[PDB]
Amino acid sequence: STGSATTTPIDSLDDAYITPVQIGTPAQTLNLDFDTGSSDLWVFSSETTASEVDGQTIYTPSKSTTAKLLSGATWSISYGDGSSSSGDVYTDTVSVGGLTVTGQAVESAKKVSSSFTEDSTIDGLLGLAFSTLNTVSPTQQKTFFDNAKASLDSPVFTADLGYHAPGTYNFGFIDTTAYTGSITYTAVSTKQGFWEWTSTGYAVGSGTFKSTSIDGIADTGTTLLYLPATVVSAYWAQVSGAKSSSSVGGYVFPCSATLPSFTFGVGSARIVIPGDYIDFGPISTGSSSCFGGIQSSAGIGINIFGDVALKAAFVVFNGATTPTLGFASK
């Protein structure tokens, strides 16, 4: 089997991407944030505290003839941005782009933190990291990809995120029309539960490439590109007036600037992020200070190849017995 679904930016900045997902019988379609940095499929629901729901579409398990309470199971997750959610668990039928999994754990939120409530466009998350990170207790649950894998034509999914435009998540096949050149594959460590890999270096604009190993994670659920402070300083030093602002929480730059590109290495190959992809707009409405799309990972503990980086590539998440990642230009 295969599936193919369009993923759409939630706003004009590509702050996140939503993909429609069918849950239950008859189908209830929710727009979920596909997140290769986590491993829980959770949704706003009829169980979510009413004051914490503000415009999201909810899953109502009592209206699904295939929903079954997973008795005793609870979940609770905290994300790198400080947001969180928790609740109980049902199993139900879940379809993405024509690919159907029966018995998928659907984690129903009883509580969500303010950032989720405040984002009316995201109805939940669909985790695509390794199932070892799933938070369901006492019986850990499998991701949608893990449950689908055996049925897929090939044990892979691909992320093709757009810049200020829709893109595609495919399951079970590699669309050879969706990229240019060849796909370069690179090793993955699953030891932390992430799609963790080592970039071979970087360049700023037209500058020379610096060969240096950068371990990080391919994370569709993180907006920006978070890299070591040395790398980030070298980038912003090429932008007149750019500075790190403790009050804003990262590097800002004059909105009048033209940003240089940023290149990252995948083996001997190179992925070029155009400068425009690094502009996240005014820090506040009407400001002439703009927020940078490349930020330091120093306070995180891990480097994160988020959407800023991934949207410049066609990315293969290869879930073979030994997983690997593939990157192609597009």
Swiss-Prot record:
Name of the featured protein: Endothiapepsin
Domain Peptidase A1: 17-328
Residues represented out of the complete protein: 90 to 419 of 419
Source organism of this protein record: Cryphonectria parasitica
GO MF term list: aspartic-type endopeptidase activity
Disulphide bridges, residue numbers: C255-C290
Listed GO biological process terms: proteolysis
Gene: EAPA
UniProt EC number: 3.4.23.22
Active site: D35, S199
Catalysis performed (reactions): Hydrolysis of proteins with specificity similar to that of pepsin A, prefers hydrophobic residues at P1 and P1', but does not cleave 14-Ala-|-Leu-15 in the B chain of insulin or Z-Glu-Tyr. Clots milk
Protein keywords: Aspartyl protease, Disulfide bond, Hydrolase, Protease, Signal, Zymogen
Family: Belongs to the peptidase A1 family.
Top-level lineage group: Eukaryota
